[PDB]
Structure formats: structure tokens, C-alpha cells
């Protein structure tokens, strides 16, 4: 009822040009606050970097609240980018319960923020089309989904296939225990992801040979497992990853 | 000589593979496209003449140790060597190695008169892996979008 | 008390310092090479590792 | 019978599948016939997944007359399951028959419209992708045979530190050598070294048969470890003339074979995309 | 005393583990004077003498 | 174009002749035919800048020429300090064959379109290295100090790998081997943000991935040595990583230039 002070102040100094310019230079300074951290920091930075945490949420959780009422609750909520900020803000109040124990630690939340620095992207060159990326790529979630969780059947079915064939087979005699084995499901997942992008694909193939017999007829016969799951997977990982940029991006 | 000799059945073999009218389409289309555009290998053939000669004067004096990842064959002791080793970074197969057997403090050839090395290897083998990874993007593009037309043909 | 400090690594020239701890930084692999001895524990960069002693020029 | 074929049998099953494939994952495999007690659970278990199985194929054939696809496909699955079982329990085979608890998932799979669609999508997008899939098979044949002349068995010979046969002991990495009057790499300071070795990587990595250079040259392409071999039938055969194979090899068939692909996979993207 | 050891010799154990296993044992047999009694046996479902 | 013939020829017979030297030495007679060789080129090169300084009073690729000249007009001499300045001069003639870029037509134009395409793509680049940044700032956190281990791994702790222990070849137990302990950090650390930009970088090239992750899987604690598959939950960073950058930053590049070329 009384208001000829807080909305004239309200919109008018959250989008007054400064304002905006300034939380810019907030969101670098909690950038580098983060990032200046290192192993075997000293006293100083380690006191600093934990004071000026803080020191800017408390800010930035006012910023929150003072553009809240500004454009209302309806136009603050229906901007995508403005819930990515409300969840960052949600997590930075949030972390002092499980700061307790550590657990997530320092979460890696407050570098999540600098989306919010791709404000100063908003005004370069063909931003409107970085909005626009986002923009289909959730858009044709649907679809992505699909073809993500198609790919991830394909890479489960020739795990439990892996760990079928060469479950507990890959101990020989040799020294080392080398961990590209078919033992549980998470490192048959793991050796199965390593073949599929290629990286020390024959290493394990050699494994697999000498653990089904050696070179013979029937021996050298497993290596044919290895061989459609490196066309089969690459296929699929261009059909999915090259069909989604290709058509989100066009 | 004898071993040269025994070898042409396989262009018989490749003439047999040459049969059939979608193999012939395709890689007639291929190659006038490729031909259509010979300035872009030459960037490509650029990009590897310079940094060759750059690591060859810079980070091969080292010697030839077994060890390491620097032996009789993978070296900068040669331009041929220089560029296998380029090309080997290229396919992408121990660059990180490399780089690392560049590292400055290795002994280097006795015949040369541990301060032998630099510290430039993470610069070159990283410009060089992104530069060439550019380039033969580039070369992929240019030669698929000269042959768009037949690409997307509707037959 | 002494333990030479350098930033060049090649040349090995001494400096004076305080600390009453004398480290080693050398490169992750190629150990048999020191790049800098000095005084004080330092940072290691990339690629580098430290090792820090208790007196003045433990590290050999 | 023909009406309970509607939505509840329909998401029991899926929900049956998807338990089979948990149990799956959990199954654990242990080396030389170990077993925990889940294993002996699990195994329990695979008999109400394979009766309820049972029970939905013998309502199915006498209800629809087996040519549907994956109504096949589970036909068979079922089918391997009843004959492993009866196999496992008159003889207290496993691995031969456990392996088709990897099919049942994709009986699963093929339940959901949205997914039998995308496959679809990408079978129909694997078709043009076969005369660039018979290029690749007549490369790693035609240099298969090249490699068959060239380095038939020249990369057997490794130092073997002379003062008795011993066992290859030569750093921990035997590699090929040669007899001086040949061109390979020499032991040189003694350590004459002699015939009789298995091979450079157990002997799966040479040029031997038509099979075992069939894998070498497919190992090429991919680009996975072709120094290797380049280095292995370097220093056995010399130093001047084995990249006019191993570049020629991955400058035909692995930068010119994955330019095809993209080429063709753009195409049909952007026909489709119209 | 009046050791007697225990060996495992299930499925799990082969490979690195039995080689590690068949050296232990070994170096513990080494810590017994004359005036101590042992004996060795080995379970895989079934309890023996090695 | 018979004076540009008449260099097309001098300036790629000058690069083959500083591309064919002897790398290893400072003395021998290829790198002194080579050696004197550059007294024919070096005068003819800079008397084209004679012949047609006079015909104007700057363009751009002129003024590589002059520098690419000046080159060796400048390591002629220099003398004094010969450990430096000649030493970077002498990699400086990597720019003779750049001067062939301008003399022959097609080869600016390619250039320049390779240039547009920088210009097109530098947002997918910088949108690439921010989220490099990002992923190193969140594995800052997570494997701060972590990766250390030591030689023997029976012990945990940098004040307990030290002095020596004994190493069997092998695996057999008749032949031990005296060995130092040393504590050694993992090749790609994550100690600070720099340090897991690079290894994030060889993460995302799929070149040694594996041992990284094998390493900071078996991380607990900071300062302490690793234990056998303590947390395999952290696979999840990996896996994340390589989807996110490694195929879809990747691909979404590759698919910007075929629809911008399309
Ligand atoms: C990967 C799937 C989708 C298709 C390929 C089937 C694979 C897994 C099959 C086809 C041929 C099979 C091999 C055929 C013969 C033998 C010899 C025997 O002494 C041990 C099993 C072994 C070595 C089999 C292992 C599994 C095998 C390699
Ligand atoms: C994965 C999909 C394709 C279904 C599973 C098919 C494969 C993996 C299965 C089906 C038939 C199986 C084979 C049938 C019989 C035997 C004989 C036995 O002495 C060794 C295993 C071996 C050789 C099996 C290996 C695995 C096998 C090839
Ligand atoms: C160089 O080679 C010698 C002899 O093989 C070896 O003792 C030494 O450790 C090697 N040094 C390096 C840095 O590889
Ligand atoms: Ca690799
Ligand atoms: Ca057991």
C-alpha cells in the first residue's frame, strides 16, 4: 500500500545497468575465490578463501530476494537460467548441514555459478544461439533420452555378456593384478567403457585370449566378442552423439 | 626384389573389389573430390614441415635411451623420424609420453658438446595435437561438402 | 641455513634463506636429476614434486 | 486365454525382465567354481524367472499359434533356458547357457515403443553404411596377404643371454632380433640370440596365418597400437621399407574409411532432417 | 605351542592370493623350534591333511 | 609470374635445405653445406624487397617478408652471447616456407577460410575451456593431495616411505632386490587448478584415462597411500566428464562446421 519507495527501487536498481555490471564482478570474484586453492595452501589463503564464502552468499541470496519482488514470482520462476541460479543459492544455503561431517566437502556448487558469468556472454556475438543450443537440446530431451538410454542397454547387455564369459578368469600367475578385469559389474562397466572409446582396446583382447586357452582354433575364437563390441559401440556412439548435435545444432 | 614381386595378385584382388556399381560411385565421387581440392593438404603438409623442423632444432638432442619414450625409432634425430613422431601424435598414441620425455633435465647425445631438453613440450605437444586436429577436421568437411550434391541424392 | 635457491633450474646458483627446512623439487619421473634445491617446503607445479628435509642441506 | 493378454501381463513381464537383469548384475562371477551365498540364492531365484517364462510362451502358442520377432527371440531364450536347466540339474555347460541371460534384456528392450522406434531409426540409418562396410573388409584382406608375404614368421628370434637357453631373459619386454648378416636389432654386447620363441605379445600379434594377420591389420586400423607392431616388424625386418606399409594402411584405411562414414551419416542425418 | 594352520584352498584364493598363501605358510613353519608340534590341513568344502 | 616462379622454386629449395640438417650435431659437413648454404638465398630474398621497396613507400604479408629476412640478416651476427638469441633465431627459420603463402594464389584463400572457421567455432572453444575449468575446479576438491603413493605398499605415509625395502623379480622369493622407498605423485595429479587442466585434457584426448582412473579410485585421504578399490563411486566423475566434454563438445563442434559448410 506504501510501495512509492521499494518498486521504483525495486526493477529500477536490479536491472539498472550496475547493478548488473557489478553482480559480474561478484560472480569473478567467487570464481576466484574457488580457484585459488591448491595443495598445501597457506594459513592466509586457507582463512580467506573459507571467510569470503560466506561472505558472498550472504550477498547473493540478498540478490535473490531483491530481483524476486522486482519482476514477481511468476516471471522469476518461468526463466530457466533464473532456477539454475535459485538451485546454486538452494545448495549454498544448504551445505551447512552436511558440513558437518564433510561429506561433499566444499561442494563444487559455487563453480556451478559461473553460468551466471555467461551474462557477459549475453551481450557478445550470437549469444541468441548459445540460448537457442540449450534451447533444443532440451527441447528434444525426449528423443536424447531415448538414444542415451538405448546406448546404455547396449553397453549393459555386453557388460553382463563380459562378465559372463571372462568373470574370474583373468588370473593368471603373473605379478601384477591388473584391474581392466570382468570381476563385479562396476569394473566390468568400466573395462566395457574403456573398450568402447577405444583406449587400450587390444590390451584387454590379449587378456581375453590367454584366459580362454591361448592361440588355437577354438581359443582364438573370443576375440570376435571384442571386435563387434568395438564396431557395434563406436556405430551407436556416432548414431547418437553425431545425430544429436547435428540436428539440435542445424 | 623376389619379395616385390610376389605381391600383384592382391591388385587383382582390389580390381575384384572394384566390382559393382555403388563401390565404384562412391569412390569415383571420393577421389574427384579429393583431387578437386589439393590446397588443403597443403596445410596440413605446412603444419607438419613446421613443427617438425621446431621440435627437431629444440627438443631432439636427447639420447637414444630404450627406457624411454625416445628410442632408434621414435626420435627427432631425422626429418623422416621427426615426422613419424608427428604422425604417431597425430593418431594420438603416447603424445602424453612424449611430452613427457621431452621434459627439460635428460641426458643428451654424448657426440653432442643434464642440461639437455626444455620446457616448451607442453606447448608443442598440445598447439600441435589441437592444430592438427583442426586441420584434418577442416580437410574432412571441405571434401564431404564437395560431394554434398551426391550425398543426398533421393536415387 | 644455506641451500641454494635458483629460478633458472639449469645453472644451480645459491641464495640465502631462513628456514630451517631444505627441500628437493624434482620431476615425477625423472628423479636422478634435481631441478631446484633451496630452503623452506614449497608448492610443486606441473611436473614437479617436493620433498623437505629437517636441517640445512639434508637434501643430496 | 486370449484376454489376459492386456496391460497387467504385459508390465508383469517387463517388471519380471527387469528383475532377471538385476540379478544379473548381482550374480558375481568367482574363479574356479567359488560361490558366496548369493550365488546359491541367485540360482534359486533363476527358476520362478524361467517358470514365469514358461507360463507366458505356453499361453502364447495356443492363444496366437512364434513369427513375431522378438516373440521368436524370447521363444528361443525360453527354450535354452528349460534345456540349461535340465542340463545343470542332471549333472551337477554353464557357461555355454548362462550367456543368454544377455539376450533376455533385449526381449526387454523390445517392450517400449520409444525405443523400438530409435532402434528402428538406427538399422534403417546402417543401411546405406554397407558398401563402406565392404570396403573395409576387402583392405583388411588385401593387406592381410601383403603382410602374409612380407613378415611370414620373419619375427621369432629374441636374445636370449648366451650361457645357456635359459628363458628369453632380455630386459622385461622381449622383443625381436636378428643375426647380424640380417638387419634387425641386435643384441649386439653378447647375448646371441636364436630361433624358437613364442612371439612379440604371446603370439597373438604376427603375421602367421591368414587369421592372426587379420587381427594385426584390423588392430592397425582401429589405430590402437600400430607403433607397436610398426616398431616389432621394425627392428626383425630393418628400418627402410615397414611404414610404406603401416602409413599407407592408415592413410587408406582409417582417415579415408572414417571420412566415408561421416560423409554418408551426414547425408542421411540432413535427408531426414528435410 | 601347538600351531596348527589352516590353508585355504577354495576357488577364490588362485592366483596371486595362493601364491602369497603357499609363501606365508612357508615363513611361519620357519618360526617353530623342536620343542613345538604343528600340523597343516586345507578346507575347499571338505577339511584335509596337505 | 616468371619472377614468382623464379621464387616459388628459391624459397621451397631453402625449406628442404633447412629441413634436411643434422639434428644432433653442431659439427659436420650436411649442416655445412647446409651450413653456407643459405648465402645464394639469403641475398636473392632480400633483393626482392630491393626491387619492389622502391615501387611503393605497408601491406601486411610484406611485413613477414621483412621479418623472415631479417632473420638472417640478424643471426649473421649477434655474436656476443652464443648460448641464447641465436638459439631462438635458429628456430625462427621456420617462417621461410610462410613466406609462400602470399606469392601463390588459392593458398591466401584457403587460409583465410580457415580463419572464418576460427571465427566461427572460437564460442564451442571457449564454451569448451570454461567447462574444462569448471571440471577442474570440482576435481580440485575431490582429489586434492590424494594421488600419492609410495613404493612399497606397505606403507601410507610420506614420513614412512622412506630409507629402503626389498623387491622379489618376478614375484619369486629367491631373488630380492634392495630398492629406495620413494613417494611419488600419480603423473596427472589433481593438486591444483592448472594441474587437472591437463589432466582433464588427456582424459578428454582417451590417451592413459584408464590409469588415472584406477589411481583415483584407490584415493581415500589426503597425505595417505592408496587402498584397493576403496570408493568405485568416483568412476562416476570420469564417466560424466568423457560424456559431457569428450563426445558431446566434440561432436557438437564436428556438427558446426558440417551445417555451417552445409
Ligand atoms: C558378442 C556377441 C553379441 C556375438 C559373438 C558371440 C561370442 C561371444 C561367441 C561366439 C563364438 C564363441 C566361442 C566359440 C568356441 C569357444 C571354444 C571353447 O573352448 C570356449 C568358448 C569359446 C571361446 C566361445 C566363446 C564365446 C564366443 C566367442
Ligand atoms: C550374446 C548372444 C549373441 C547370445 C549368447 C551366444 C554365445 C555367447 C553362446 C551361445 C552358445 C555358446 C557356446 C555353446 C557351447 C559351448 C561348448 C563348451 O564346451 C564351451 C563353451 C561353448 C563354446 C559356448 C560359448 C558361449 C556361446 C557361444
Ligand atoms: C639410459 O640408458 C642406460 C643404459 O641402458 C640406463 O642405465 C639409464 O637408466 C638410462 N637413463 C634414462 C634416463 O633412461
Ligand atoms: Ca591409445
Ligand atoms: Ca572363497
Known amino acids: 500500500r506504501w510501495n512509492r519507495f521499494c518498486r521504483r527501487k525495486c526493477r529500477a536498481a536490479v536491472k539498472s545497468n550496475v547493478f548488473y555490471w557489478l553482480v559480474i564482478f561478484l560472480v569473478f570474484l567467487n570464481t576466484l575465490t574457488i580457484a585459488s586453492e591448491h595443495y598445501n595452501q597457506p594459513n592466509w589463503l586457507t582463512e580467506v578463501q573459507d571467510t569470503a564464502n560466506k561472505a558472498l552468499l550472504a550477498l547473493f541470496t540478498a540478490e535473490m530476494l531483491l530481483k524476486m519482488y522486482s519482476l514477481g514470482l511468476q516471471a522469476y520462476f518461468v526463466s530457466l537460467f533464473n532456477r539454475f541460479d535459485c538451485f546454486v543459492v538452494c545448495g549454498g544455503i544448504l551445505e551447512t548441514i552436511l558440513v558437518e561431517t564433510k561429506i561433499m566437502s566444499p561442494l563444487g556448487i559455487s563453480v556451478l555459478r559461473c553460468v551466471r558469468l555467461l551474462r557477459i556472454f549475453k551481450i557478445t556475438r550470437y549469444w541468441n544461439s548459445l540460448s537457442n543450443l540449450v534451447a533444443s537440446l532440451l527441447n528434444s530431451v525426449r528423443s536424447i533420452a531415448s538414444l542415451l538410454l538405448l546406448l546404455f542397454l547396449f553397453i549393459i547387455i555386453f557388460s553382463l555378456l563380459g562378465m559372463q564369459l571372462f568373470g574370474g578368469k583373468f588370473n593368471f600367475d603373473e605379478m601384477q593384478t591388473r584391474r581392466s578385469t570382468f570381476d563385479n559389474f562396476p569394473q566390468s562397466l568400466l573395462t566395457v567403457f574403456q573398450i568402447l572409446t577405444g583406449e587400450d582396446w587390444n590390451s584387454v583382447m590379449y587378456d581375453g585370449i590367454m584366459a580362454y586357452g591361448g592361440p588355437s582354433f577354438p581359443g582364438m575364437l573370443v576375440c570376435i566378442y571384442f571386435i563387434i563390441l568395438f564396431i557395434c559401440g563406436n556405430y551407436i556412439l556416432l548414431n547418437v552423439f553425431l545425430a544429436i548435435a547435428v540436428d539440435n545444432l542445424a | 626384389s623376389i619379395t616385390f614381386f610376389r605381391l600383384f595378385r592382391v591388385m587383382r584382388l582390389v580390381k575384384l573389389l572394384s566390382r559393382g556399381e555403388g563401390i565404384r560411385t562412391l569412390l569415383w565421387t571420393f577421389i574427384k573430390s579429393f583431387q578437386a581440392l589439393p590446397y588443403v593438404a597443403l596445410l596440413i603438409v605446412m603444419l607438419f614441415f613446421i613443427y617438425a623442423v621446431i621440435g627437431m632444432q629444440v627438443f631432439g638432442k636427447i639420447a637414444l635411451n630404450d627406457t624411454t619414450e625416445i628410442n632408434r625409432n621414435n626420435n627427432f634425430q631425422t626429418f623422416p623420424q621427426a615426422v613419424l613422431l608427428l604422425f604417431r601424435c597425430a593418431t594420438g598414441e603416447a603424445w602424453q609420453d612424449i611430452m613427457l620425455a621431452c621434459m627439460p633435465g635428460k641426458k643428451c647425445a654424448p657426440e653432442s658438446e643434464t642440461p639437455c631438453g626444455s620446457s616448451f613440450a607442453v606447448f608443442y605437444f598440445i598447439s600441435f595435437y589441437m592444430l592438427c586436429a583442426f586441420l584434418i577436421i577442416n580437410l574432412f568437411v571441405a571434401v564431404i561438402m564437395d560431394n554434398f550434391d551426391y550425398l543426398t541424392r533421393d536415387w | 641455513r644455506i641451500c641454494y635457491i635458483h629460478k633458472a633450474s639449469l645453472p644451480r646458483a645459491t641464495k640465502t634463506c631462513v628456514e630451517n627446512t631444505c627441500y628437493k623439487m624434482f620431476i615425477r619421473t625423472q628423479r636422478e636429476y634435481i631441478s631446484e634445491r633451496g630452503c623452506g617446503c614449497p608448492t610443486a607445479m606441473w611436473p614437479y614434486q617436493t620433498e623437505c628435509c629437517k636441517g640445512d642441506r639434508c637434501n643430496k | 486365454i486370449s484376454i489376459v493378454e492386456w496391460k497387467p501381463f504385459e508390465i508383469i513381464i517387463l517388471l519380471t525382465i527387469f528383475a532377471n537383469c538385476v540379478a544379473l548384475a548381482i550374480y558375481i562371477p568367482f574363479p574356479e567354481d567359488d560361490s558366496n551365498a548369493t550365488n546359491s540364492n541367485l540360482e534359486r531365484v533363476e527358476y520362478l524367472f524361467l517358470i514365469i517364462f514358461t507360463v507366458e510362451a505356453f499361453l502364447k502358442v495356443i492363444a496366437y499359434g512364434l513369427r513375431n520377432g522378438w516373440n521368436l527371440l524370447d521363444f528361443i531364450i525360453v527354450v535354452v533356458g528349460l534345456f540349461s536347466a535340465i542340463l545343470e540339474q542332471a549333472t551337477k555347460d554353464v557357461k555355454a547357457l548362462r550367456a543368454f541371460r544377455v539376450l533376455r534384456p533385449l526381449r526387454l528392450v523390445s517392450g517400449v515403443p520409444s525405443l523400438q522406434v530409435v532402434l528402428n531409426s538406427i538399422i534403417k540409418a546402417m543401411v546405406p553404411l554397407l558398401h563402406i562396410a565392404l570396403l573395409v573388409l576387402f583392405v583388411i584382406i588385401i593387406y592381410a596377404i601383403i603382410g602374409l608375404e612380407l613378415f611370414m614368421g620373419k619375427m621369432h628370434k629374441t636374445c636370449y643371454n648366451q650361457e645357456g637357453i635359459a628363458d628369453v631373459p632380455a630386459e622385461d619386454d622381449p622383443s625381436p632380433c636378428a643375426l647380424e648378416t640380417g638387419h634387425g636389432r641386435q643384441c649386439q654386447n653378447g647375448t646371441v640370440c636364436k630361433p624358437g620363441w613364442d612371439g612379440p605379445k604371446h603370439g597373438i600379434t604376427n603375421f602367421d596365418n591368414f587369421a592372426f594377420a587379420m587381427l594385426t591389420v584390423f588392430q592397425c586400423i582401429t589405430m590402437e597400437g600400430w607403433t607397436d607392431v610398426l616398431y616389432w616388424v621394425n627392428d626383425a625386418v630393418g628400418r627402410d621399407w615397414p611404414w610404406i606399409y603401416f602409413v599407407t594402411l592408415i592413410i587408406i584405411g582409417s582417415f579415408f574409411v572414417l571420412n566415408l562414414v561421416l560423409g554418408v551419416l551426414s547425408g542421411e542425418f540432413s535427408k531426414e532432417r528435410e | ?50 | 609470374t616468371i619472377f614468382t616462379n623464379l621464387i616459388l622454386f628459391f624459397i621451397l629449395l631453402s625449406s628442404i635445405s633447412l629441413a634436411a640438417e643434422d639434428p644432433v650435431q653442431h659439427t659436420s659437413f650436411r649442416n655445412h653445406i647446409l651450413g653456407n648454404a643459405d648465402y645464394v638465398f639469403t641475398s636473392i630474398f632480400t633483393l626482392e624487397i630491393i626491387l619492389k621497396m622502391t615501387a611503393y613507400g605497408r601491406n601486411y604479408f610484406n611485413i613477414l617478408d621483412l621479418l623472415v629476412v631479417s632473420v638472417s640478416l640478424i643471426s649473421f651476427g649477434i655474436q656476443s652471447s652464443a648460448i641464447n638469441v641465436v638459439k631462438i633465431l635458429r628456430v625462427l627459420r621456420v617462417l621461410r616456407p610462410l613466406r609462400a603463402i602470399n606469392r601463390a594464389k588459392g593458398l591466401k584463400h584457403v587460409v583465410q577460410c580457415v580463419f572464418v572457421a576460427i571465427r566461427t567455432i572460437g564460442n564451442i572453444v571457449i564454451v569448451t575451456t570454461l567447462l574444462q575449468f569448471m571440471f577442474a575446479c570440482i576435481g580440485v576438491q575431490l582429489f586434492k593431495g590424494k594421488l600419492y603413493t609410495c613404493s612399497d605398499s606397505s606403507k601410507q605415509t610420506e614420513a614412512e616411505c622412506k630409507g629402503n625395502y626389498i623387491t622379489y623379480k618376478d614375484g619369486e622369493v629367491d631373488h630380492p632386490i634392495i630398492q629406495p622407498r620413494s613417494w611419488e605423485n600419480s603423473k596427472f595429479d589433481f593438486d591444483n587448478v592448472l594441474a587437472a587442466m591437463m589432466a582433464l585434457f588427456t582424459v578428454s584426448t582417451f590417451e592413459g584415462w584408464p590409469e588415472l582412473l584406477y589411481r583415483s579410485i584407490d584415493s581415500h585421504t589426503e597425505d595417505k597411500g592408496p587402498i584397493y578399490n576403496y570408493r568405485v563411486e568416483i568412476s562416476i566423475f570420469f564417466i560424466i566428464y568423457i560424456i559431457i566434454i569428450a563426445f558431446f563438445m566434440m561432436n557438437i563442434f564436428v556438427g558446426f562446421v558440417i551445417v555451417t559448410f552445409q
Not at chain 5, 1 to 23: A, E, P, Q, W, Y
Not at chain 5, 32 to 50: G, K, P, R, T, Y
Open chain 5, 1 to 50: 605351542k601347538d600351531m596348527l594352520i589352516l590353508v585355504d584352498v577354495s576357488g577364490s584364493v588362485s592366483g596371486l592370493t595362493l601364491k602369497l598363501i603357499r609363501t606365508s605358510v612357508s615363513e611361519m613353519l620357519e618360526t617353530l623350534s623342536d620343542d613345538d608340534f604343528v600340523n597343516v590341513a586345507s578346507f575347499n568344502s571338505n577339511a584335509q591333511d596337505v
